[PDB]
Symmetry: C2
Subunit: 213 residues, 2 copies
């Protein structure tokens, strides 16, 4: 109820932001959609940026907690050897699958919002996500750096974003894409099946010869 | 002026759709932003779907005309041998670079709109784009099919969409991503440089071993 006031606000915000983007979604629209008063939004968040940050954290909090625990667990193994790109990419997939569903469209909505964070240049969010989750992500990225052939760092940056974009687009558009596949091929491909298909594609892309000559 | 009434409408629509998405953009908002009357929108387009279709065609029309001419030209060569994945992917990049700039952000806006076509399940547009550009695209895709190792067709479908998503995300978010690269690495990476970096990444991904076992 205190929990639920916050949940109703975050559910309203996450749906509206995913539908309309950040700029076009007001706090008063979120308030009316959440069925709470504006003071509740003021109390719990205090600004649109803080509410955007909290919507992200409701997804990334459990994910990163769980990813960190699993890295710790895998690196504590007595016979632990270095993760391969496929290991590391599968790890992220298994971790995303492990996140307790809320909307039942959780990965797609996260990825929709992630793309909007880029297209609406949400610098504040980049700073926040660094401040809160930067440790585990830096740790993960170093393992990816190590598992791939040596690349110019700037090229590594772009290839990581190619992976992220492929994932974000596929998941953001997963309803349309699964409808297309049903129409064109007569199959249902599941969201977890799609994520597993990304793995060989991404691993090979990461290992490709440099395009900086 | 008749040309320019249509251009003012399409400029307004393309910017608003890119900013707010299709559902939240009305024809009356487009009309007021374009500085024309509603009757002009009625005359030239007649519906929101037709206006969405025309916004796409203003990008794809010249692109596909030029892609078709270049395929015809390359396949007319007396000593013409089969295009490799890198050839074909570079071809699309060179063709995108050749499109005469309008906004100066043309590729990014096209790609923003393309992602919105998926996230807002614009079936009408899929049907229209087929009807108008399906010939040249089918032709191109067959060459890609042929240039890659044999894959389950459903896996080929997903890998093509991974390529498209990586491209669409990168270009849609190119302002944010170039700002990030400037901050993190002190470089300007140009949009054409980014597209060329996708090529080895995509070619290798397309060639990766199947993830269907």
């Amino acid at each position: 109820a205190q929990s639920e006031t916050v949940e109703r606000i975050l559910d309203a915000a996450e749906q509206l932001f995913a539908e309309k983007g950040f700029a076009e979604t007001s706090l008063r629209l979120i308030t009316s959609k959440a069925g709470v008063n504006l003071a509740a939004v003021n109390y719990h968040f205090g600004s649109k940026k803080a509410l955007i940050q909290a919507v992200f954290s409701r997804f990334l909090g459990p994910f990163c907690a769980s990813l960190e625990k699993e890295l710790d667990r895998r690196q504590a193994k007595p016979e632990a050897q270095h993760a391969t790109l496929e290991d590391l990419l599968h790890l992220l997939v298994s971790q995303a699958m492990a996140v307790k569903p809320r909307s039942g469209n959780d990965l797609s909505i996260f990825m929709r919002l992630l793309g909007l964070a880029f297209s609406q240049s949400q610098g504040h969010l980049r700073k926040y996500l660094e401040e809160v989750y930067g440790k585990v992500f830096r740790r993960y990225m170093l393992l990816v750096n190590e598992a791939a052939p040596k690349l110019p760092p700037i090229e590594l940056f772009w290839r990581v974003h190619f992976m992220l974009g492929a994932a974000a687009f596929s998941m953001s558009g997963i309803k349309a894409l699964r409808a297309m596949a049903e129409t064109d091929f007569g199959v249902n491909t599941s969201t977890e099946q799609v994520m597993h298909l990304m793995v060989p594609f991404f691993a090979a892309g990461m290992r490709a010869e440099s395009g900086i000559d």
